[PDB]
């Protein structure tokens with residue numbers, strides 16, 4: 001039996017993010033379960049406590065995870081979060097690596113809103129990918145949450161909204177597979193870049209796998225080159241134009257531009273209602289007991 | 291496009307693959323509850339769904355045996371619709387970071403000895419005892435260990451006369467090598483003893499995390515490691531009941547009726563000297579089914 005904070009019982013690993021590791025535990029007092037991020041204190045570069053503050057700044061936003069309790073305790077900084085349903089990668093695999101157009105558009109609509117909300121509290125996420133989107137439990141079950149603000153950062157000053165400066169020679173940050181063209185080239189990341197990664201997440205959900213996925217070297221140069229060489233028209237072939245239009249828009253944004261988040265959603269909701277779907281949140285994984 | 295197999299069962303996503311065929315989640319539209327639905331191709335080279343269904347139909351009303359819901363053909367497939375069960379012991383071991391407490395291995399051992407005995411009481415050997423083939427039950431029945439997958443199962447005696455199948459040598463391996471019996475490796479026909487021996491290795495795996503003969507770099511090496519590793523090395527640092535358990539199984543003759551009760555009581559006794567309550571609380575109790 002393992003206790004943290006003198007009120008939580010620590011169970012088993014249920015996750016691994018960018019830093020730390022996530023486990024199941026129980027609020028012994030409340031009588032209800034939780035996610036418990038742990039980072040060991042003898043890491044070269046501490047992070048949980050910074051991330052913890054990013055969560056308190058996002059709190060009370062649609063599909064932003066609730067933080068129950070934060071603090072350091074012996075050898076582990078710890079962060080108790082509301083427990084959440086499974087990730088879109090988990091669901092994607094449960095659905096055998098293929099989602100209907102309906103599920104990809106219900107998700108697209110929520111994914112763009114969480115990204116927009118982060119951008120309005122002055123942060124970029126920088127690792128938009130299937131694992132960092134999660135469905136809530138029970139009441140909040142048709143609601144995509146966003147997680148892992150471990151690589152996120154301020155892109156503009158909280159007071160003046162002055163954008164961060166443009167620069168170059170940045171290292172890779174974020175998952176190679178879904179990075180922006182610009183990140184592959186070493187350009188400082190901005191809002192455009194978060195939404196362009198969503199773009200690849202959406203095509204990944206349609207294709208089953210991107211075409212720069214599953215190459216085999218002995219660096220990641222290769223990924224970069226085929227992502228940059230793939231004409232959008234060819235990546236999106238056999239899928240609605242709206243997916244090429246979203247990505248061309250994002251690829252066409254400028255470093256400090258405010259993306260038009262209403263327009264990008266609009267592509268998708270208009271495609272949605274033109275196909276004859278009903279906005280009932282029946283997803284592809286709907287026969288589960290969330 | 292929606293799809294009702296039979297008239298009653300809505301097909302959904304794949305959640306399993308056993309020895310043959312595949313398993314999909316499905317919903318019993320009428321009764322509002324959920325089911326698991328096995329599928330095999332009609333034109334498959336070695337048809338066994340009809341056969342497996344007969345074994346389940348006859349084993350029905352056995353504790354920890356899944357209920358047969360429905361059987362028929364549809365399109366290119368044979369279908370057997372079953373009770374929905376919860377996750378395997380393999381799945382759960384992994385969730386517990388490949389570590390099961392002694393209470394859980396004993397609580398598990400009791401039920402696993404009984405299931406095998408039940409199978410044997412219905413005149414079959416399973417031949418692939420292993421943690422993937424033991425599943426916990428759902429909701430009401432989350433305390434219950436169930437057993438699945440009789441695609442490799444065999445009649446070891448007549449139902450009428452209890453006449454034993456005859457000794458045979460030079461058999462090819464049937465079932466997983468990691469948990470096979472010493473004699474299964476030597477190519478002797480499989481009997482009741484071998485199910486119980488296989489279980490002994492499962493139990494010891496639950497203790498160790500991994501068995502000694504796994505991870506190795508052409509399976510002949512799995513075999514020859516198993517016959518270097520005497521039980522008293524395998525089982526060192528753990529209660530002796532495990533060694534006793536294994537030695538006993540290795541001593542049964544080909545057609546012996548194992549004393550399941552004796553092998554059950556080795557464990558029950560140790561359970562109550564450790565001071566545990568037989569309360570059905572497993573290491574994975576955090577979970578919620």
Ligand SMILES: O=C(Nc1nc2cc3c(cc2[nH]1)OC(F)(F)O3)c1csc(NC(=O)c2ccccc2OC(F)(F)F)n1
Nearest residue numbers: 015022035037065081082083084085086090091094147148
């Ligand atoms: O990861 C889960 N909950 C979770 N993770 C969190 C991570 C968090 C957090 C809260 C969190 N809550 O706050 C935080 F910011 F600290 O980070 C979870 C719940 S169920 C589940 N998965 C599976 O049921 C699963 C798994 C594998 C394969 C198929 C699977 O089945 C599936 F997902 F397809 F249904 N994962």
Ligand SMILES: O=C(Nc1nc2cc3c(cc2[nH]1)OC(F)(F)O3)c1csc(NC(=O)c2ccccc2OC(F)(F)F)n1
Nearest residue numbers: 306313326328356372373374375376377381382385438439
């Ligand atoms: O295999 C599952 N149900 C099933 N299998 C069957 C097989 C059958 C059958 C019925 C069956 N019902 O009748 C039959 F005889 F035809 O053969 C199942 C239910 S839940 C699940 N898995 C996980 O919850 C899981 C997954 C990944 C990691 C950890 C996991 O478990 C964790 F981590 F949640 F504890 N598998």
Ligand SMILES: CCCCCCCCO[C@H]1O[C@H](CO)[C@@H](O)[C@@H](O)[C@H]1O
Nearest residue numbers: 093094095096304305306307315374
């Ligand atoms: C009704 C219980 C829901 C649990 C579903 C778990 C699904 C994961 O396990 C299976 O699914 C894989 C694809 O996601 C396949 O590889 C299956 O063989 C099995 O691993």
Ligand SMILES: CCCCCCCCO[C@H]1O[C@H](CO)[C@@H](O)[C@@H](O)[C@H]1O
Nearest residue numbers: 013014015016024384385386387577
């Ligand atoms: C709290 C809800 C239970 C969900 C457990 C899902 C288990 C699968 O995913 C995790 O499990 C692995 C083994 O159980 C861990 O090693 C984690 O890395 C994670 O992948």
Ligand SMILES: [Cl-]
Nearest residue numbers: 253254255256
């Ligand atoms: Cl620019």
Ligand SMILES: [Cl-]
Nearest residue numbers: 261262265266
């Ligand atoms: Cl809008």
Ligand code: NA
Nearest residue numbers: 017018147148
């Ligand atoms: Na995380």
Ligand code: NA
Nearest residue numbers: 105109268269
């Ligand atoms: Na949409």
Ligand code: NA
Nearest residue numbers: 307308309439
């Ligand atoms: Na099976």
Ligand code: NA
Nearest residue numbers: 396400557558
């Ligand atoms: Na016992």
